[PDB]
């Protein structure tokens, strides 16, 4: 046993599925008028864009959208035991002597 002891952190992530509630008349949308724009000319490709800008709004002042985590699908990141290689994060910092 060396002189110290140590705590350990990990992370983890979980794919989950949500019940998102959204109340009525929370937003009023302003639908625009779209357009077709050409650019990036090639020997053959005449690439286009169909752009359509839309303006949103927040009607009520209180909150009107509630999310909840309600499932576990997998544990994608596995709670490994592999430490972090500080030689690789700090390539510059090293000791004095070569050998």
């Amino acid at each position: 046993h060396p002189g110290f002891a140590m705590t350990v952190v990990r992370t983890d992530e979980v794919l989950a599925e949500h019940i998102l509630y959204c109340s009525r008349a929370s937003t009023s949308m302003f639908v625009g008028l779209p357009s077709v724009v050409r650019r990036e000319v090639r020997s053959d490709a005449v690439t286009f864009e169909i752009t359509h800008e839309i303006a949103s709004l927040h009607t009520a002042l209180g909150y009107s959208s509630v999310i909840a985590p309600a499932h576990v699908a997998a544990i994608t990141t596995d709670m490994g035991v592999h430490c972090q290689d500080l030689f690789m994060i700090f390539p510059g910092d090293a000791y004095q002597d070569r050998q």
């Binding site: 077709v36 949103s56 999310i67």
Partner: protein, 49 residues
Amino acid sequence: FTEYAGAIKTITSALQFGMDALERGLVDTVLAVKLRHAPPVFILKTLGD
């Protein structure tokens, strides 16, 4: 003639590809607006009382 029909049955399809892609952004962004103004339940229950 039926090579020219292979032109108009291509470009009027690729317009309709933009007709769908327009309607995706209406479903996407309006949903993606709502997720930038949505706290989870464990915040909003205690504040909601």
